[PDB]
Design a binder for this molecule. Structure first.
Ligand SMILES: [Cl-]
Lengths: 249, 248
C-alpha cells in the first residue's frame, strides 16, 4: 500500500573525479531487487561525469538546485539547460539554500511550480528550526512551507512532487531526532495533503526523511508507515548508501 | 599595455548543440597575437568546453564559486574546480552582487580565497544609475576595489583581473560611451597606482564589461587604460572572433 520508495544520495558540494568514479562503481555493482527509485545528486560540474559512469538501472540523476529560466543569471543553472543535458530531477528548497542563500517560500514555491511545468520530478524540502520547535511551531512552519508550494500547483502536478522533511532542529545543534519524531511530522504532512489536495494524492505521495540516516537506523526509520525513503547526506558519499537502499525493502 | 584578455561571459545560456557549434567556430579562428581568451560557461557545460575547445589561446573560467567544499547544496567549490581542471573564475559579477547577496565583503573574501588556491580571478565592479546620478561613480567602484584589495597581497594581484561593468547602462535605457569607459578605467588604475603600487597598476588588466560587439571593440580597446572585454550577448555569437581580433 506504500508508494514506491526513494533513496536519494545528496552529495552536496563534495567530490573529486577519483572520488566519484570509485563511488559510482560501488553503486553500479550493487544489485537491487525491489522496486525503489534511487537518486544521485552531485554538483553541477560533476553531472557529466556521473552521467558517463552511473549505470545501475535503479538510479536517476538530480540537480541540487536550479532556476526557472535561462538568461542573465551569472553563476546559476537554469531548468531548460538541465533538460537539454538530460537531467529530469531537481532538489528545491533545501534548508542550506533557505538558510545560507536566502531562499524564501515564494522563491521555493515558484521553483517547484516552474519545474513541474517543465516536466521535472521535484524533491522539495521543508523543515523547522530548533527555535521554531521550541515554540510549538513544527506544524505552523512545515504546513506554511507546504501550503505555499501547493498554492502554485494543480492536482496532476503532484505526481512529480516529492517532499523531504529536514529536521533542521537536529542539524549541528547537538540535538537528536527519533524515528518516532520523524514519523510524527511525516504523518502531519500527509494529513494536510489528504485534507487540502486529495486522498489519492496523499496515499501516493512520497515523503522522504532528510535527517541523520546510516546503515543502523535506516530500516527502523523505513519501518514507519508514512516514511517513503530518505534524503541521505554524509552516508551517501560512502558504500554505506547501498545498505540504506537495502533498508527500503 | 599588458596582455589583453577577451572573456566570453555566457551567463546562464547555452545548449550542447549551440555550444559545440560555436566552440568549433572558435576552434577554426586562428589567433596570432599575445592575448588570453576566456570562455565562461555554466557549471554543467564546463566538461563539454574543456573537451571540445582546443584553441591554445583559450582558457575556461567558472562564473562563480565558493571557497570550501562541504554541506552547501547547489554550490560549486573552488577545490572541486581545481580537481576538474578549472583555474579561472569570475567573482563579484553584478548579477550576483544584485540578486544573490554578494556584498563587497563577500566578493572580497571569495577573491582572496581564490587567489590563495592558485586561481586567476576576474573580479567585477561597477555602479548603478542611482549611484552614478548621485556623483558616486568613483565612490562605488573604488570602495568595491578597496574591499577586494584589503584581502590581497602584492603577489596575489598578479592573478587578479578587474572588470568594470557599467551597471548604470544595463536595462536602463542609458548607454555608455568609450570616453565614459576610459574615464572609469583611468581612475581605477590610478587608485591602484596610489594604494597598491605603481608596479601593479601598470600590469593590471582592467576589462570593459559593457556592450561590446565587432563595431565598437576596436574603438574601445584603442583607449589607453582598457585592457580587453568581458563580453555578454556577443560572446555567444561567431562575432566574438572579431572582438578578439580587435584586441590586436
Ligand atoms: Cl561505507
Amino acid at each position: 500500500a506504500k508508494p514506491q520508495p526513494i533513496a536519494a544520495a545528496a552529495w552536496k558540494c563534495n567530490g573529486t573525479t577519483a572520488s566519484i568514479e570509485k563511488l559510482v562503481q560501488v553503486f553500479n555493482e550493487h544489485t537491487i531487487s525491489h522496486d525503489v527509485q534511487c537518486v544521485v545528486a552531485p554538483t553541477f560540474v560533476h553531472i557529466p561525469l556521473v552521467q558517463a559512469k552511473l549505470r545501475n538501472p535503479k538510479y536517476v540523476i538530480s540537480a541540487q538546485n536550479a532556476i526557472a529560466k535561462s538568461g542573465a543569471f551569472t553563476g546559476e543553472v537554469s531548468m531548460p539547460i538541465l533538460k537539454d543535458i538530460g537531467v529530469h530531477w531537481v532538489i528545491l528548497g533545501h534548508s542550506e539554500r533557505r538558510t545560507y542563500y536566502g531562499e524564501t517560500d515564494e522563491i521555493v514555491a515558484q521553483k517547484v511550480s516552474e519545474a513541474c511545468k517543465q516536466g521535472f520530478m521535484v524533491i522539495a524540502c521543508i523543515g523547522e528550526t530548533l527555535q521554531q520547535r521550541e515554540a510549538n511551531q513544527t506544524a505552523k512552519v512545515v504546513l506554511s512551507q507546504t501550503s505555499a508550494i501547493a498554492a502554485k500547483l494543480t492536482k496532476d502536478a503532484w505526481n512529480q512532487v516529492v517532499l523531504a522533511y529536514e529536521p533542521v532542529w537536529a542539524i549541528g545543534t547537538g540535538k537528536v531526532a527519533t524515528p518516532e519524531q520523524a514519523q510524527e511530522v511525516h504523518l502531519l504532512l500527509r494529513k494536510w495533503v489528504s485534507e487540502n489536495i486529495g486522498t489519492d494524492v496523499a496515499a501516493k505521495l512520497r515523503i522522504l526523511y532528510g535527517g541523520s540516516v546510516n546503515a543502523a537506523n535506516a530500516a527502523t526509520l523505513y519501518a514507519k508507515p508514512d516514511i517513503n525513503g530518505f534524503l541521505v547526506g554524509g552516508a551517501s558519499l560512502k558504500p554505506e548508501f547501498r545498505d540504506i537502499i537495502d533498508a527500503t525493502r
